Amino acid sequence: MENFQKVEKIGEGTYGVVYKARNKLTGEVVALKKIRTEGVPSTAIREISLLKELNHPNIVKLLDVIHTENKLYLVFEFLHQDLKKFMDASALTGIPLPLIKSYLFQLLQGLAFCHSHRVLHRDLKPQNLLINTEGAIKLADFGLARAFGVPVRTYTHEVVTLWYRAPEILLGCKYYSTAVDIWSLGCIFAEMVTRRALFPGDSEIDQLFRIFRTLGTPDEVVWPGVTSMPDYKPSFPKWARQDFSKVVPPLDEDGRSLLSQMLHYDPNKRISAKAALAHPFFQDVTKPVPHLRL
């Protein structure tokens, strides 16, 4: 829209590119996402508009939707840093536990809210978790999944990431629930603590086997019905589960306990956001502020 002026490529992804942009009229800085086009499904519109109605302190607000010439522009409230950059800037020092605790608490608050409205994110990753200098963190592109279907690459064709993909999805489950977001969040939580991606797979089979080497190869004992999954293969290598003490050192036992429940193979036993909020780990939760390098 000739009402916005891009300032810098802020992100890249599936749908399209993300830009920091200054509204030429109101003067506000927003985040713009240009998506790519035969007629633009009205279904994607209905659902994109329904997403515009959810307001919570931990979800990046979708100010507006500009459908022009079969091209979609999404205007979002702007935040100053994604969690990925913030992690790289903390690579040597690490993020303090009080801040990690808070971020997790807020992130679960937004999740609890979205989920109670039957809305799920579907593709959480450090790249769409945005923080402000006031100590808050928000979910971005929340629900932008029920707008299309998972392709093969990005706008210019690149590399998405199966690193944060829950196992039910890697295994062919098409009707997954809100639980996939908790799984994603758990991976991110672990990454914040250790400063290294939990499961950096380089293919769908590497992703899966990586989860298997750490949490052990799943079977009907921990995940009933897993063998009926579309992509399950009786011939998967059988790895044993490694203790979390080795996966997320030196996070405390309350966190490890919480992370554990967020990373349970069985989607149904996977703790929900609302319950996660009552976990003992958040007993001494506060709202510390980050030290951002903008």
Ligand SMILES: CNc1nc(C)c(-c2ccnc(Nc3ccc(O)cc3)n2)s1
């Ligand atoms: C990569 N995909 C992204 N998507 C949205 C909606 C993003 C968004 C929304 C609002 N504010 C910001 N800020 C920001 C993003 C990346 C940065 O590296 C720095 C700041 N980003 S980023």
